[PDB]
Design a protein around this ligand. Sequence first.
Ligand SMILES: CCCCCCCCO[C@@H]1O[C@H](CO)[C@@H](O)[C@H](O)[C@H]1O
Ligand SMILES: CCCCCCCCO[C@@H]1O[C@H](CO)[C@@H](O)[C@H](O)[C@H]1O
Ligand SMILES: CCCCCCCCO[C@@H]1O[C@H](CO)[C@@H](O)[C@H](O)[C@H]1O
Ligand SMILES: [Cl-]
Ligand SMILES: [Zn+2]
Lengths: 33, 33, 608, 608, 608, 91
Amino acid sequence: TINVTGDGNVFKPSAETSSTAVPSLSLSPGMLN
Amino acid sequence: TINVTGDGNVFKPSAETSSTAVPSLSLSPGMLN
Amino acid sequence: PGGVPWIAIGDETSVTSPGALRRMTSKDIDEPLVVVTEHAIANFTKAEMALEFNREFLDKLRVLSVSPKYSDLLTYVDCYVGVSARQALNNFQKQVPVITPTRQTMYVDSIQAALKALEKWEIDLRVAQTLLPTNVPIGEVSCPMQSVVKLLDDQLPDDSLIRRYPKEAAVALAKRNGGIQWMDVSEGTVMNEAVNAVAASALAPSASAPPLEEKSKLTEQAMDLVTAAEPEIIASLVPVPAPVFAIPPKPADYNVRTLKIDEATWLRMIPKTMGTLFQIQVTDNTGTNWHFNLRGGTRVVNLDQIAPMRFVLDLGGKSYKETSWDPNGKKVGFIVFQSKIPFELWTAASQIGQATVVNYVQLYAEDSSFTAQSIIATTSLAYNYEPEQLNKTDPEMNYYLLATFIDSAAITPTNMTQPDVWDALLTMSPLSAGEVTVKGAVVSEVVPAELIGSYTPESLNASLPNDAARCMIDRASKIAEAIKIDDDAGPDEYSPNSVPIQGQLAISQLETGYGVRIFNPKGILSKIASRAMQAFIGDPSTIITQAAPVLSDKNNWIALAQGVKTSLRTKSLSAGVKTAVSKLSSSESIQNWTQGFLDKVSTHFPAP
Amino acid sequence: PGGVPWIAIGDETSVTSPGALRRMTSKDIDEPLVVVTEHAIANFTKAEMALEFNREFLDKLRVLSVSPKYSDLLTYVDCYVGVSARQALNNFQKQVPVITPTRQTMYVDSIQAALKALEKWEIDLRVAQTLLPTNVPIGEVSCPMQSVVKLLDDQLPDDSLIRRYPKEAAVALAKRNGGIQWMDVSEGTVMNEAVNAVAASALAPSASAPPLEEKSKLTEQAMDLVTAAEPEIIASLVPVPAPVFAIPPKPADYNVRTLKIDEATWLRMIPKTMGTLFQIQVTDNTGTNWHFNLRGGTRVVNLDQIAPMRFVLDLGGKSYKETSWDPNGKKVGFIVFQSKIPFELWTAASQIGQATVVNYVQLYAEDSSFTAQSIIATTSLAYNYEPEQLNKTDPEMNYYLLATFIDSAAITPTNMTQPDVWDALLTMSPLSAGEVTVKGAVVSEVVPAELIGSYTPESLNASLPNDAARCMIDRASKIAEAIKIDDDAGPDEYSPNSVPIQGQLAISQLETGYGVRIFNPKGILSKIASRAMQAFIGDPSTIITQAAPVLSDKNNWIALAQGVKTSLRTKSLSAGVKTAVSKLSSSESIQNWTQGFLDKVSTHFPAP
Amino acid sequence: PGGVPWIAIGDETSVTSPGALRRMTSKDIDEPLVVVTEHAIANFTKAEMALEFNREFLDKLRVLSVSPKYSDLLTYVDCYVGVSARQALNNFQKQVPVITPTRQTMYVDSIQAALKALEKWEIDLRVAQTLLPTNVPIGEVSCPMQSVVKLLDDQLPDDSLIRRYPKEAAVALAKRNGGIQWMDVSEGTVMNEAVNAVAASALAPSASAPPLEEKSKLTEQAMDLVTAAEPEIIASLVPVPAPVFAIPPKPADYNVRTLKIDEATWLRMIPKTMGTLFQIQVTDNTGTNWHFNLRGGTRVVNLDQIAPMRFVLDLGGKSYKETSWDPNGKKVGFIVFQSKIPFELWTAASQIGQATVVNYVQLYAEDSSFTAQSIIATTSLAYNYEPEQLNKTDPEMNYYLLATFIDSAAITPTNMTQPDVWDALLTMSPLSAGEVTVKGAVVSEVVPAELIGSYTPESLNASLPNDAARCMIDRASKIAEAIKIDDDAGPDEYSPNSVPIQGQLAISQLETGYGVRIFNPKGILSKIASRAMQAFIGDPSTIITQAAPVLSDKNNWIALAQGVKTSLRTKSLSAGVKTAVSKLSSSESIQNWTQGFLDKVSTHFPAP
Amino acid sequence: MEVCLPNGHQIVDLINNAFEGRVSIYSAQEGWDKTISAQPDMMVCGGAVVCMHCLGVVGSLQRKLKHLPHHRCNQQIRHQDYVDVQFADRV
Ligand SMILES: CCCCCCCCO[C@@H]1O[C@H](CO)[C@@H](O)[C@H](O)[C@H]1O
Ligand SMILES: CCCCCCCCO[C@@H]1O[C@H](CO)[C@@H](O)[C@H](O)[C@H]1O
Ligand SMILES: CCCCCCCCO[C@@H]1O[C@H](CO)[C@@H](O)[C@H](O)[C@H]1O
Ligand SMILES: [Cl-]
Ligand SMILES: [Zn+2]
């Protein structure tokens, strides 16, 4: 229910909103036990 | 209420008391979520 | 906990589809909300501590008296939790730490603003802690606190904030160094004011073991090396895509004239003793015509199949001075030919196909240390071989690169007799890190294990900068580096990293093969394995070198490459026996040194 | 939780100022106390496990039967918590894990003392796990446990503790390798005794994906590289302080004689063809007088503005043999001049200002491979240029460095005609990592982006070891290394790391400029971008090289440098498609190899 | 929690010995069970999030609609916990997260299978986020969302999944980039849909400080370097076992002919001017006889005591052309002698003891740039010196290595007059990383501190590839690298990493020694210290170089090496003042650049 | 003991020697002395010691050999497959 081609959309990249997903986690053997 | 120039002060560096503050923490994106 | 807070769109509990949910916002306790993770809480809290180490100073500075306290800004809420609606839908949670972006930002900005204020105090305080030894590797050391302050007072920079807030500095230090204690003038009491006893416990040696943090870190650094090497790739027995196998390459040097054409498969040459000699003319991309001769001895680089490559020629130091030819003021250039006729067969100008002088420089000569000889100034004649630019279509097309003297006037064959100016330093640099070659030509994939022991010293030296062997060697050396971080074995001593080879050797001499069989006792196989591993660590290229004692066999390589993973992963905060003693022995000598220095301090800044 | 425990100095609850608090001590449950963090608890507990992996052995060894158990020494207390009083003052906590330094130390010393005991057992046990394959990259492999023990028995070192405690070793292994199971003689039962199933799940491949730990680690290693490169610094468009921009430099080699003075701005030369020639005399710092000649051709290094620098000259291999001059036994030296007159203008001894022979060595010559030529032995004539020692005051003062033959006897001009002994190998090493130069002269700050595409090959080669370009290149290569860890793109294939350039190119060809405009479809811009990125990864110096196809434009550089951050940070435990298949394909071949070996084992050590 | 679940073998509570316990299995709630750690729970949960970032796509793809949810497969149980029985015996726990291996695997396989499905979508989505700037270093930037989509549509690869699921891509992006928001057509509402506000807060700059993640990471990277250098080892004042001290070595080049025998202690030579000359005959390991001459000038390598070593000789570029001798077609070889007579004393064939031609190659010559000279093609004559293979027994036995012309026909002394073919490029590579030498000979242990300032440039250059100095230098440079990551001090400015030296200097000038004493104010000692540190960072080899200003003193070295540990460890998420401003200043310029680009985008893809 | 094939330049060297009658041949019967003909077991090809039964490198000139080294030999190189070289060298 959004229009990729519509108005009212927002493209304001900012330092506070640095995109990130899940690059790496803590999976070493000694830590997972 | 201490005297930097007074007696009774102690200067005994030891392995057990290795000075440390907060050099680094775990701030990776995937970990902070 | 983690993700975002979701609330039932309108109907309490009767929530069923992901549609029945909506991003819980601030207007439910108008920014959207975010789950503050267990991790985030623990770490940002530790950030606050960073400020509290200098509380006494911060206040005496009348700034940020309101210590941030993260747990304060958090708002616990019951709700559905998840990154998506669906996930959230089947995950209701009670007491979820939540916060709005703006508040999270406002919080961090308070911590950062504070750190910015501590900016200099942070430095001046560290300067005080390193001007003289404030710590010791093992044991304990002492010095008249008054002598210490005398010293600081005599050496600290004038602008040090410590000179302006001595007492605050005192607390600050005592707050982080259990060894620095200030007596309470009030109760004549004196004690450890440090807040980091737990941390320091991991950084100190026990009566016979190095610090746990050290043993842990080093072993971690060995494993990261092994992971970066990629055991599965370098020990693979099946093909591996070039892009996947390759890594950032390094340049290589050659003197095209001194290479052996039966070793460097990328060179072609016009046979001497045939009286072959013919003058030709070629233009550069600006239409300017150039003159030069091809004759017996002339060499060229067979561009086809070498992958993107940059060439840079340095005629510096060379002579080329002949009875009727002075290199000074002359010009050299790179010419790229496109012909269907093999270069070795050339004898007439008609066979050169399409040619273009792609670059040229004018030479400057002077007198060298060698009498009667002229020395040419350093050059950097460059040419980038971009396969896509040439656009080879006709399979019978050959692409050649030449470096000779070019001139605006026909070059008299009896004046300048050199075949080319390839007797120079040539530096090749790959213009791609996704293509790999094997002994001169591109390959779409590599079989790492077959590289083992298949290169002679001659062949390796002649390989192109993007040769699979060279790459194998750089990946392998990370393994060698890893083994050395963990292995302190001396000559002929076995170890967890040498036995993998021993195992292969043990079975190998039993396998039915051909030739005179030999039987070595475990004790001798153990040594041979040790030496093999040492040779590998001292010269990783031995694995791709022909007839290299033990590393020349792909089985011993695979066993080692794969073994290391197990060798490291099954360790328990351990350190080599030999190492453990050496560390403690050394830590003691440093501790002793530390004391001897502190004594000199006490002597030159006597306590009252 | 974290920090230190604080108790109300005397008044229950009526605590208000930070003064109303005091460091809670042991005498409240006479050492001070410390908060044991959530983190410290979790990790030291995992340390204990390190000992329990060998419980069976430890006990059979009658040592530390009392397994440490950290949570036991902890003492939970209600109190105010914080690093400082103020922070603590507004943070009351219930059930805070607390401990005294002495007890924390006593605890760790118990764990360490235990590990010290396991010292050898740890090694012998790993030796058993790597002698033959104890693991496999993917899938599963098998071998008659009896054949395996047969092998071990035939190969393990005599002094192995495993030979002395076979059954304990069995448990030990089974405790960490789910693949090693010992049947219970009692109930004919057999099963996984390993305690690390969770951990191993992260180290294993799924039917079509590499291990999660691997994907995570590698991506982490790419990001650390990008962070160490400092995107904001290398892509900066405004000035950056030299100290901040610089990094540990590397040495560089030159042959001052073959450099082009219109390329190396730090060299000066007396013009030839002017009949310039004059003998002078200079003393060394011990008052000894030396003779040498300056004439047409003589070159010197203009010391001013090159920053702290060490020079080392190697005349090894050179001749300098003339009809009436034999280098054997002669002496060469470094002379530093201080004059107001420009070197090019010198013709009489009166213009040299203040001169000192700062160092000299005696040469040894022999016969070289080249007939009639003498070959000089290797030299290491050194000179450290420390600007502060010279103390330039008069702005019209020039500082020059020369390298010639010096002698106790006047050097007859017609005997030794060389202008200097600069036709040698000169190695420069910066004596500072806080100063940077640009094409020969020092600059207080750099504008990274303007370095892009402004160096010719000639200029780069002539730059000093502390040149900004060289530095830019070493920082940039960390980016190249990062992109390669993540990118497995083949020739002309787009990728998350190539498109940033494509974007700049897409807009660039639309921007109104000057010259004949061209329009390339997305498909072609995509390729050009790919090749640019490959050229960068294969030769990071292309970004500071003039006319370098696409990387020569500062916009494409900035887009790439900054893009990589986003490219990596928005990944989700992923791995390249091409890579994913290659890894599994390779893991399988290794698994197969592992089996084939285990078979040979079974064959040469048959089970009963 | 961690380890494995243990249940009372048969008797409730009356459990006393470790025997009274048994591995709790699935048949108690037939696989064994494992404790799922607090850590494992937190991280695998975060793994699930990886999938949920693309929930909208995954469902529209009709795959894994059942989001894994780890906490679901966990089974909480009351039991005894531990890796061993004993430990478990005294550790009863309530509500222990437990799981069977098979279920843990089944779980991870669900997450991996999912990621495999996201394989391409993951890439196409990142490609969309880097095609144009999706982020900015500091501040904020904007662009007509319609212009952005116009651009993407004009540039994204045809096969991009984004072109097939635009709306899903929208959500996906908005889910990770708070800056990308899609208006709800329904309520004209628009807002941040990102789920990573907390994370991003650590990656952003505050008004005057760089990101906390950056400051943290960099400082962490400096510490890892210091740990890898091993402060206790490189600053040790007592002996350290060679194996422990050594690290992976690098090759070294020499021209045996140009070395000074009073500098390279591993060379021997037959004195010239004695008319010494004698022809000998030696066979190779295939029984073939060879001829060659030894005479005045002939040099050899004294193999004894140099440790495992590989030699490779390159005669490329050399001439060796004489009136009656042409190198073209001739042969050179490596001969290893075993004699009790010192080499210098040889004059007759009878003194050479046991000799063997261990390797040989045939040379190819052509014409060089130098007229009248012939240029020999590149060679790679190799020889591996393995001490164990020679098996030296008799202490009076000397082991020598020679490189000369060998021929099947006696070599006429007046035709080929060269003493050997050592005027070539020799490359030595250690065949072991567990042995170390000091100035030519092996040593079983090293005293790091005594290496300080004991090498002249000549001596360092002549040392073998496995020399302790060379190693000391590579370990030390990790320290230099570390200091530079943290220090942004300009010329003559003090810092936490320079003062350690200042302290030593301060006391040193007070110590009673010998010679004319001098007193420098703190201000000057501060500078001298700064310069010393800079010289060290710019050229780490200065510490082992003789008379090197301040680093030549072992005390200043130890103070620095040990100081750095304290300098870094006492930091609090801080960054240099000079750096902090530069970073923000640069981030701003990039932000500005980002905007300027987005404008061009808006201009060439106008919004409706 | 896996073995690899020799490199191109080493075979070129074998040929060059053959036409000078100096190929170093080893036979179990006569050892390294080729005065008396016997079927080759090993030949030296540009430094490498090659097995004439599989053409694999089983050694080098550096370490002396008294017998044909025990190796995993494919044994598919027949005498007829290299006799032309042996003939050239002996003649
Ligand atoms: C934490 C302990 C720090 C000790 C450093 C003490 C530095 C002394 O500092 C000096 O103190 C004098 C007396 O107040 C002043 O008169 C001087 O101006 C001041 O520089
Ligand atoms: C964990 C499994 C380890 C298997 C290694 C077994 C090594 C066998 O060790 C051998 O056992 C014999 C019978 O007890 C003894 O007589 C030998 O002295 C001993 O060396
Ligand atoms: C997350 C925002 C993604 C914006 C990318 C939009 C890419 C547009 O994609 C285009 O959309 C057109 C209209 O549906 C189709 O006709 C085209 O075939 C399709 O390629
Ligand atoms: Cl962590
Ligand atoms: Zn064979």
